[PDB]
Amino acid sequence: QNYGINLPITGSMDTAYANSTQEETFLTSTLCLYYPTEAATEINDNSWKDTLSQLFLTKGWPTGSVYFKEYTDIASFSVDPQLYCDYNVVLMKYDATLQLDMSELADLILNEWLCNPMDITLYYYQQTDEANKWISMGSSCTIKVCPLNTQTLGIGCLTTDTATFEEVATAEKLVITDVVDGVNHKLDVTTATCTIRNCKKLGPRENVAVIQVGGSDVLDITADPTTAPQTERMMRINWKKWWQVFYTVVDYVNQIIQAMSKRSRSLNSAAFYYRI
Amino acid sequence: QNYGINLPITGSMDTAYANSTQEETFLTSTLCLYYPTEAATEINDNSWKDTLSQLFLTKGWPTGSVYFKEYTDIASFSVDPQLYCDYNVVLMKYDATLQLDMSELADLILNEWLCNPMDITLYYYQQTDEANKWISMGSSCTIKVCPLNTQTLGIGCLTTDTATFEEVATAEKLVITDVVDGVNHKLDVTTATCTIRNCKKLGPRENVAVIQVGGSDVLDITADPTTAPQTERMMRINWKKWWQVFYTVVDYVNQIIQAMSKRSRSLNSAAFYYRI
Amino acid sequence: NSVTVRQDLERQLGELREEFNALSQEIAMSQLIDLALLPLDMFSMFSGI
Amino acid sequence: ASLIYRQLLTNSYTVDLSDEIQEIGSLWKEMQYNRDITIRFKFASSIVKSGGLGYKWSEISFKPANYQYTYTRDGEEVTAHTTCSVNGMNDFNFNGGSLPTDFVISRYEVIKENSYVYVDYWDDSQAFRNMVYVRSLAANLNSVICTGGDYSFALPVGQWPVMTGGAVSLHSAGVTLSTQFTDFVSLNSLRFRFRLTVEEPSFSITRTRVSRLYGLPAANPNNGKEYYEVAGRFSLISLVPSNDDYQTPITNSVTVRQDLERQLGELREEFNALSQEIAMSQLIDLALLPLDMFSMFSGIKSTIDAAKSMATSVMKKFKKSGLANSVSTLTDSLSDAASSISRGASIRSVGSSASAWTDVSTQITDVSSSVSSISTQTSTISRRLRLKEMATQTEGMNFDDISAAVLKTKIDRSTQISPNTLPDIVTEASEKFIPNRAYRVINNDEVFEAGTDGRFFAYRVETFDEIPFDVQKFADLVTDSPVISAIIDFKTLKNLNDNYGISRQQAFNLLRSDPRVLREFINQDNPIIRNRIEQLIMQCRL
Amino acid sequence: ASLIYRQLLTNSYTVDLSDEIQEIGSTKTQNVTINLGPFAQTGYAPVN
Amino acid sequence: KSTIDAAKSMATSVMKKFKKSGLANSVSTLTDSLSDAASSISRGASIR
Amino acid sequence: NLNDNYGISRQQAFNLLRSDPRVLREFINQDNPIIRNRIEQLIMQCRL
Numbered sequence A, B: 001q002n003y004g005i006n007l008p009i010t011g012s013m014d015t016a017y018a019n020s021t022q023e024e025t026f027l028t029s030t031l032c033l034y035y036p037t038e039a040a041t042e043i044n045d046n047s048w049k050d051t052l053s054q055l056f057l058t059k060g061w062p063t064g065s066v067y068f069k070e071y072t073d074i075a076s077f078s079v080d081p082q083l084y085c086d087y088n089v090v091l092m093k094y095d096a097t098l099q100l101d102m103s104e105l106a107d108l109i110l111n112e113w114l115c116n117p118m119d120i121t122l123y124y125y126q127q128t129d130e131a132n133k134w135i136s137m138g139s140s141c142t143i144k145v146c147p148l149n150t151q152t153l154g155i156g157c158l159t160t161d162t163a164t165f166e167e168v169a170t171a172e173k174l175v176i177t178d179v180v181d182g183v184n185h186k187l188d189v190t191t192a193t194c195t196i197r198n199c200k201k202l203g204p205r206e207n208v209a210v211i212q213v214g215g216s217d218v219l220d221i222t223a224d225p226t227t228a229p230q231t232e233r234m235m236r237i238n239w240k241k242w243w244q245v246f247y248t249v250v251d252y253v254n255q256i257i258q259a260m261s262k263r264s265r266s267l268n269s270a271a272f273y274y275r276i
Numbered sequence C: 001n002s003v004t005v006r007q008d009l010e011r012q013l014g015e016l017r018e019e020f021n022a023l024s025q026e027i028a029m030s031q032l033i034d035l036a037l038l039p040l041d042m043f044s045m046f047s048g049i
Numbered sequence D: 001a002s003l004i005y006r007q008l009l010t011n012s013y014t015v016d017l018s019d020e021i022q023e024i025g026s027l028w029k030e031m032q033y034n035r036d037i038t039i040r041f042k043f044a045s046s047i048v049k050s051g052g053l054g055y056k057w058s059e060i061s062f063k064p065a066n067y068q069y070t071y072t073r074d075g076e077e078v079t080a081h082t083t084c085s086v087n088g089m090n091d092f093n094f095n096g097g098s099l100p101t102d103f104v105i106s107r108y109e110v111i112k113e114n115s116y117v118y119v120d121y122w123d124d125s126q127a128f129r130n131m132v133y134v135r136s137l138a139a140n141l142n143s144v145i146c147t148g149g150d151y152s153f154a155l156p157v158g159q160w161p162v163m164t165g166g167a168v169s170l171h172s173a174g175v176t177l178s179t180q181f182t183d184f185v186s187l188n189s190l191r192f193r194f195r196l197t198v199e200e201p202s203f204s205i206t207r208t209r210v211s212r213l214y215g216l217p218a219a220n221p222n223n224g225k226e227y228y229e230v231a232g233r234f235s236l237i238s239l240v241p242s243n244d245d246y247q248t249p250i251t252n253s254v255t256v257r258q259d260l261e262r263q264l265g266e267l268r269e270e271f272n273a274l275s276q277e278i279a280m281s282q283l284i285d286l287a288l289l290p291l292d293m294f295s296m297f298s299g300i301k302s303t304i305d306a307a308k309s310m311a312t313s314v315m316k317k318f319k320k321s322g323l324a325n326s327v328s329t330l331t332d333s334l335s336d337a338a339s340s341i342s343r344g345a346s347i348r349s350v351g352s353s354a355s356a357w358t359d360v361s362t363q364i365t366d367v368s369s370s371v372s373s374i375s376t377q378t379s380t381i382s383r384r385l386r387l388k389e390m391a392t393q394t395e396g397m398n399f400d401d402i403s404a405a406v407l408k409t410k411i412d413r414s415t416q417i418s419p420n421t422l423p424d425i426v427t428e429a430s431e432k433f434i435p436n437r438a439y440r441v442i443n444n445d446e447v448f449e450a451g452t453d454g455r456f457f458a459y460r461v462e463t464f465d466e467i468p469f470d471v472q473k474f475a476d477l478v479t480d481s482p483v484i485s486a487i488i489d490f491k492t493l494k495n496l497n498d499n500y501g502i503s504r505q506q507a508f509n510l511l512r513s514d515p516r517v518l519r520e521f522i523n524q525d526n527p528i529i530r531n532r533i534e535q536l537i538m539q540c541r542l
Numbered sequence E: 001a002s003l004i005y006r007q008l009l010t011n012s013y014t015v016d017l018s019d020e021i022q023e024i025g026s027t028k029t030q031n032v033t034i035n036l037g038p039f040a041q042t043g044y045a046p047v048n
Numbered sequence F: 001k002s003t004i005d006a007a008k009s010m011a012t013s014v015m016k017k018f019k020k021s022g023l024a025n026s027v028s029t030l031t032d033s034l035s036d037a038a039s040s041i042s043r044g045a046s047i048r
Numbered sequence G: 001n002l003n004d005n006y007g008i009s010r011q012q013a014f015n016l017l018r019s020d021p022r023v024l025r026e027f028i029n030q031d032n033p034i035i036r037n038r039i040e041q042l043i044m045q046c047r048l
């Protein structure tokens, strides 16, 4: 492939459409459903997974192709999210208080990132361009920032004294820091319970879809204030019972998968590509 | 200009892109940031304005062009808001209970208005066209309206007994009243505490952009029920901390102002033009 | 100690690249060539700054 | 020969590099003095102790030390005085702890290979009163070994630490002139530099975790020795003012004109007088030399200080004169004209198209003589064709070549030279040499000619008959095409053709200022060319 | 192509600058402040 | 091959010895002789 | 393109091939679209 990646692909505008590959896609694919604990608690059934697998079979998926992963809550799920199957549908409960955390999780899992380590104790770090962010994940990520100037002296802060730093994150499981580009910063992060990485957003991750259960369109997967794009993979539904939610997911799995593109599944299950 | 306002301007669809060689009244433009008091409180620093100025300088703004106007809250800021700089960016904190007040403020400052005094004690007033409204603001504005008929007799109210009038606003720092057009209304207002004007919406402002911090898309800058336009000048972001909000504003100031246009700043700082 | 991995001149040089690319379009052509024949030496190049 | 001017301008940047270090720094007869000297010196120690009970010393450092002695040189008992100092020292420190009890040395100085030892030396001998004007100075000396000695520390409690060991070899590296400040007079002295080399004896402090340390601490660097001695020879060449071959001053403390004048006032007359003895053909030969910096400044018989800074002093003065500012203004005007299609209105063109070479300017204007507009235009243009001369945009030999040749042949002959005279006489010469000079441009067998004096001439090459001068064509030709200095300007050319009928090839070469035809005409003793070159040389009058 | 010799001869004036820099540094080179290791310098108490 | 700490002076190192050699001396002598000839200085006897 | 639309002299072609500045400025002063376009391409190519 790589020797033909930078080569043109020519096609005529009269080639006959091929038959529907939805059946073949379902047969040779795997589906991962991510739901919160409250869903399982409300269902209160020990065979609901088997029921959903049988219903998906009625919808064409082979038996052992649909998998279900449970997370305690949005904040818990945001610590090193792992996307396993070819298609990853995430049922995210809506809370008016966790809006930024919902947006950060969606941004992390609905996009492909290229991350590198940051040794905050040794080097001063800056963000090169609008695609560059600092993604911090851990049990408790408290990030404080001290911008510098051309002479390396801090502005509004003292490098020696951390108490003067401009705190930007406190007690966070996942945070995406966006500082002014081209400015060197000195960072204080709770490295004991936090890991911060310099990440670049390569583009969309088309095999991950997020269904927001309840609320309104609040997700903002773009740091740019001027744009809040709602993509095809950002679904939203209204709910009263989790069983109805799962039935809607099963029945319209055709539409959900049709909004997602395969071949975006990395060899690893991580939410980012780690490079040294 | 005035003698050449109504003259055609002809341009070719192949003219090479260039840049103006015309003098401006001021050498450079000025940027005003309007933020709530709680933003400064949470930031908890005395030199934060200086640091933001230095970061804006990093973003190409000469030292002396960025100004920061603090306002207590949305309601207080809604009393005769003043727009000083060439570019005005208003950081409105979202509160779920003040949706109408946020909409009223956005409508006032995102649109040009042409207003006249209203001696409600001497004359009845109509609203001629859908662009006509009654904008009242002050320390506390309560508006009571009695629609009259062709015979100048109140409908569902007694023109002499104010107790029968209809309540359209109670203790409002700012309120835009829209009544049925072509109907004479007898008005009684808390004139001691607020002033009411008959205003006409001329069009968009193009130099005032409102960034809504938190919430969902709730602004309605048009009184027409069947329209909720989301212009490029009304942005929305999610937040947990104010330093991150200000860093986002600084880092994407080029995008923020690309959505705005100069040439719209009035000579006066007021949010409306006034005729007596 | 702590070393600044990426130098402080990156942002200033980026802005100056922007300015230079904006200024390119306002160059006269006859006079540019007239300048091109001047043997621009150390003194001539660094005196008019 | 004009290249020298260009090079000075081209190299003017190095001048700035000089000033930095400088502001970081702070007829004649040759007579030789080789003297076998014995520098006897020593160090001093500053031991400032801190407060408390005396366990802590605030500083133990070096201090310059003076010494006096007498020694025999060629049977002469010579009294000598020396002053030894050190530079570039390593500030070690010992910190036994934060308590007032613990042994602490805040800062103690050790001289290592990165240090230097300076020794001023003076004696009442003849050689040291002849060294006011020095041609060359160089001293060789046998290296000496300075070993550190014991030094016990005054603690009233416990074992007494001892600073033993330490050694460095001083090797002679450089000797210069220096001054000794007495009470009522000032003495010229020889200051010798010595590079340090660490030696095997390593200094250590007892009662401490200090061992195998190398250098020479300031505690007891003399090691009980009365003095440290180096024996060697210094060679000095002194320039004594002499106006006759039978006298020779014992001492050279004489005053020269530059000890009393900073602005050369009458040396201008000296140069103007020197102009008489200038040969013509040989002057052309010298003018054809690409006189570079080395060639220009190598033949001057300078003093020790003057040669050390001749080029950069000349260039410091050079990058301020009217010539340098004219070059700068021309460059800025060209860059501005190229930099914006905005102000073709501000500049007014006397040609088909706008050019910095072809712009009219202030020209306060002279109502004294009835002046044509064309004359003013041509003069304004020629005053920039001079910068064309000094921008390598000329074809034949230029007036700058003659100016440089005259400058060289005069500075070598002129007996008035000094570190301040050569500056402002090279620069002011370049400014004031040949002020009225003409230029010509050839095109389609037709010659256009302009002059700074305001005289313009159009003619034909095949026959020298004047033509209606076509301004707006001379300008377009002169902005781009090669410009030729008019050494043999039109009037002389026509006189020569009428009286000495010259061939087509000879006229071709004369028009383009070819050196060969010029020198061949000079060698024939042709009165017209000799007269023209005499006028040119007398114009080089400073 | 022969310009190396010409340039070496012409630029020789900078040798004087080199010599001045050398002999001025030794005059006014600052004393070097040598650091000390993280493990330093404790000793016994003064004992009699 | 640039043994660093010597490239700091290589050009000046060569130039300092270059402006002492027979080539430099001959260039200077020729320049001085040309200046003298331009000045009508009495050239030595037997010089034709 | 020049020789076809603006058939040029033998001397002009000779000089243009050798990139002689005189003919370049001549053609620019005549306001030649082709050479002006070429020089504009070069200048806008002069970005950093």
Ligand SMILES: *[C@@H]1O[C@H](CO)[C@@H](O)[C@H](O)[C@H]1NC(C)=O
Binding pocket: A019
């Ligand atoms: C595609 O669909 C058509 C229509 O039913 C069918 O005849 C054909 O066999 C299918 N398969 C392929 C490979 O075309």
Ligand SMILES: *[C@@H]1O[C@H](CO)[C@@H](O)[C@H](O)[C@H]1NC(C)=O
Binding pocket: D275, D276, D277, D534, D538
């Ligand atoms: C006198 O000076 C002129 C030019 O100034 C020169 O040609 C001439 O040789 C000098 N001396 C004599 C004796 O002619």
Ligand SMILES: [Ca+2]
Binding pocket: A100, A101, A104, A172, A173, A174, A175
């Ligand atoms: Ca978060």
Ligand SMILES: [Ca+2]
Binding pocket: A156, A157, A164, A165, A166, B045
């Ligand atoms: Ca601070």
Ligand SMILES: [Ca+2]
Binding pocket: A127, A129, A130, A132, A178, A179, A180, A181, B251
């Ligand atoms: Ca950023």
Ligand SMILES: [Ca+2]
Binding pocket: A220, A221, A222, A223, A224, A225, A226, A227, A228, B236
């Ligand atoms: Ca956004």
Ligand SMILES: [Ca+2]
Binding pocket: B100, B101, B104, B172, B173, B174, B175
């Ligand atoms: Ca309101």
Ligand SMILES: [Ca+2]
Binding pocket: B156, B157, B164, B165, B166
């Ligand atoms: Ca009523």
Ligand SMILES: [Ca+2]
Binding pocket: B127, B129, B130, B132, B178, B179, B180, B181
């Ligand atoms: Ca209405």
Ligand SMILES: [Ca+2]
Binding pocket: B220, B221, B222, B223, B224, B225, B226, B227, B228
């Ligand atoms: Ca509406």
